Design a protein around this ligand. Structure first.
Ligand SMILES: [Ca+2]
Ligand SMILES: [Ca+2]
Length: 312
């Protein structure tokens, strides 16, 4: 498998569990520190990063009823400059740039207790596909599906429904949506970390997925596996292979990686493209830092970059 070794330029450091890199509608960059703890208890943070200086500013330290969150994944909304954050203790949060937030769901559409989330992906229709590797949200005792298969998948629809679309995953992690050229969502890809697998489904409609299938295989026998993911403008899927020192590159059809990207660290966690560029910002857990490197092409436009009132 061809392996490229681009130059990684340091962005910022010392972010415990450095995760969920994201750009908002203004081009501002955000990172979440899920593993920040105070006295041994969760006290995760959502930070804004000045790309010019690398200086960190924590805008939100989410907590509901004394229970601190473990914010791990992000997506920027389109109709409003706000962030949808997957939290391992609080579920789905909507965080404003001013630092204020709101917990989206205590229970799903079936009245079942919500599970802690890790990452999410907006389809062009506005539906948010979320991975829930943890057990029930706070105040429930913290649990995560690294060893047992109780991880779930949700779809938070445009009409405000938190619908559980599947379960029994061994730590569902990164997630991405494949769209047709005309913009129609048609395939959901989900990473199952420890199993070294990437799963896929046919998106039949909002919160409607069918035909679960092992779409791709993650290299290595190291502890870890597929973490964060995203598509480039050509629909190639870059996946951070946590613990492998590489970011895997899958073709439109999946299977085995058609290329790998060597990182100057062992634990790449998540990644995100800077709008209108080839620049990929990468978070990693070896040094708990953020880096950036140039990819061969631009990224696939995020839902937040699309237009509600566009013509084409
Ligand atoms: Ca993740
Ligand atoms: Ca991303």
């Amino acid at each position: 498998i061809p392996v490229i070794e681009p130059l990684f330029t340091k962005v910022t450091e010392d972010i415990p569990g450095a995760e969920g890199p994201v750009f908002d509608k203004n081009g501002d960059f955000y990172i979440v520190a899920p593993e920040v703890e105070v006295n041994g208890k969760p006290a995760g943070e959502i930070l804004r990063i000045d790309l010019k200086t690398g200086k960190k500013t924590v805008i939100c330290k989410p907590e509901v009823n004394g229970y601190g969150g473990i914010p791990a994944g992000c997506q920027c909304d389109r109709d409003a400059n706000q962030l949808f954050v997957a939290d391992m203790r609080l579920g789905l949060l909507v965080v404003q740039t001013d630092g204020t937030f709101e917990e989206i769901a205590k229970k799903d559409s079936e009245g079942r207790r919500m599970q802690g989330c890790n990452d999410c992906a907006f389809d062009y229709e506005g539906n948010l596909w979320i991975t829930a590797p943890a057990g029930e949200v706070a105040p429930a005792d913290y649990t995560r599906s690294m060893q047992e298969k109780f991880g779930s998948i949700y779809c938070f629809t445009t009409d405000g429904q938190m619908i559980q679309v599947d379960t029994a995953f061994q730590f569902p992690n990164g997630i991405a949506v494949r769209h047709m050229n005309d913009g129609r969502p048609y395939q959901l890809i989900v990473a199952e970390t420890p199993t070294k697998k990437l799963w896929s489904y046919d998106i039949k409609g909002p919160a409607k997925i069918e035909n679960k299938k092992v779409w791709g295989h993650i290299p290595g026998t190291h502890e870890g596996g597929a973490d964060g993911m995203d598509f480039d403008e050509d629909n190639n899927l870059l996946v951070a292979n946590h613990g492998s020192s590489h970011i895997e590159v899958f073709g439109p059809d999946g299977g085995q990686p058609k290329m790998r990207i060597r990182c100057p660290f062992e634990k790449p966690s998540n990644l995100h493209f800077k709008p209108q560029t080839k620049t990929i910002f990468v978070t990693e857990h070896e040094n708990n830092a953020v880096w950036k490197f140039e990819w061969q092409r631009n990224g696939k436009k995020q839902y937040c970059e699309t237009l509600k009132f566009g013509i084409f």
